[PDB]
């Protein structure tokens, strides 16, 4: 008794990151395959590269169990950072907004203290975790948002490891943005742990997805 997941005008990226124009009426839990247009209107509303994208669509294509849960709760994970960041490029009903499943972390009280956040998969299912790395268009923006010019983002899981050094770059304007957010994801097998360490530039997970590929 399994129907396809209909994404409407949205891409998998827009749907899985929580593009504010991509909330379905009935949030579905299992599905046979994903239906999406050749050029969906609404995907990465803040421009940037979605890494290993077709692979994620393959892996999300058949799903028997799907549960959203707040991996790093907004009102308790980040006491010393500003979490409320929105963007005009991710607007909804004419108001600036942001991906529902991510949080733009920025400085607080003139400081961006080094962060370190761990999550251990006790869901007894695979857990899909998504995050982003911000590349500002100039160094003034880098300092204003993150108070460092030597930023690092490191993500380590037992089956994925990567240290990002986001550098400044003035790219062509896309949805009014010259900077970029690059999007990444990893599937956490049960019992595995993921660690985020950063001193800036991290678009942090807020919601993750426990899932069974049945």
């Amino acid at each position: 008794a399994s129907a396809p997941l209909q994404l409407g005008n949205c891409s998998v990226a827009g749907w899985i990151l929580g593009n504010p124009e991509c909330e379905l009426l009935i949030s579905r839990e299992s599905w046979s395959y994903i239906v999406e247009k050749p050029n969906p209107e609404n995907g990465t509303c803040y421009p940037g590269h979605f890494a290993d994208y077709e692979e994620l669509r393959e892996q999300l294509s058949s799903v028997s169990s799907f549960e959203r849960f707040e991996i790093f709760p907004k009102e308790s994970s980040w006491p010393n950072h500003t979490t409320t960041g929105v963007s005009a490029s991710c607007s909804h009903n004419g108001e600036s907004s942001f991906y529902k499943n991510l949080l733009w972390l920025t400085g607080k009280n003139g400081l961006y203290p080094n962060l370190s956040k761990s999550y251990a998969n006790n869901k007894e299912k695979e857990v899909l975790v998504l995050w982003g790395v911000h590349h500002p268009p100039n160094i003034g923006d880098q300092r204003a948002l993150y108070h460092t010019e030597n930023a690092y983002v490191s993500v380590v899981s037992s089956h994925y490891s990567r240290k990002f050094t986001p550098e400044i770059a003035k790219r062509p304007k896309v949805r009014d943005q010259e900077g970029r957010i690059n999007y990444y994801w990893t599937l956490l097998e049960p019992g595995d742990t993921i660690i985020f360490e950063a001193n800036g530039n991290l678009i942090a997970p807020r919601y993750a997805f426990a899932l069974s590929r049945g």
Partner: antibody, heavy 133, light 100 residues
């Protein structure tokens, strides 16, 4: 060196209007709210209102609503306060003052998304406006 | 909607004074005569970068306080508390004299 440089001393007649300018340097003008505060001779500070230079939205003090107009020109990083129907007891020093909270970083498309007043951390040198008939 | 400060306070050099503000996100400003105000304390007790830790803020009941330790003559000035409830409200101000 973050700095607010205000326009020069003004002398006006009662019933006139005065427009004071406040030019920001050393930071991105659209990133922070801009308050106006005045102080009559020997008196305390009194808030006049704020403008959000990114959007142009304003919030005026009860004492001045109906009489004060705040505007800005972002291309020249300048805030303006116009106060009309002047009376002698509008003689005062008028200060522009930057709100301390970073609210926007427009070249990165970042917005704080929520506003609360925590204080004013950079101030202009002040403008003397004398009203006399 | 208004905050009440004492009209004046005085202290000898090296002492500590406390200025009160009765009505915790109060901010405090120092103004020397003829010069622009200066932010000394915000959010009740934080100091902006570069402000001396001789200045500290505290609360108690419906009273916020600014304490200055190790008074120096340059601390002679007017002090304003400030709060907000949809509108920014300054206290009436305290003239602090460092007795000479």
């Amino acid at each position: 060196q973050v700095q607010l440089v205000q326009s020069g001393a003004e002398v006006k007649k009662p019933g006139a209007s005065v427009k004071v300018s406040c030019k920001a340097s050393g930071y991105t003008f659209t990133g922070y709210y801009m308050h106006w505060v005045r102080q009559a001779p020997g008196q305390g500070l009194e808030w006049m209102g704020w403008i959000n230079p990114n959007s142009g939205g304003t919030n005026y003090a009860q004492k001045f609503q109906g009489r004060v107009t705040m505007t800005r020109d972002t291309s020249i990083s300048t805030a303006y306060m116009e106060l009309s129907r002047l009376r002698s007891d509008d003689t005062a020093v008028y200060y522009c003052a930057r709100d301390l909270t970073l609210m926007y970083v427009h070249s990165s498309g970042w917005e704080r998304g929520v506003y609360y007043y925590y204080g004013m951390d950079v101030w202009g040198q002040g403008t003397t406006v004398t009203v006399s008939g | 909607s208004a905050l009440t400060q004492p009209a004046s306070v005085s202290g000898s050099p090296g002492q500590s004074i406390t200025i009160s503000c009765t009505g915790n996100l109060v901010s405090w400003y120092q103004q020397h005569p003829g010069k622009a105000p200066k932010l000394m304390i915000y959010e009740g007790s934080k100091r902006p970068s570069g402000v001396s830790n001789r200045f500290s803020g505290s609360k108690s009941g419906n009273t916020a306080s600014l304490t200055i330790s190790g008074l120096q003559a340059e601390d002679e000035a007017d002090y304003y508390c400030c709060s907000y409830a949809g509108s920014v409200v300054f206290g009436g101000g305290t003239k602090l004299t460092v007795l000479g």
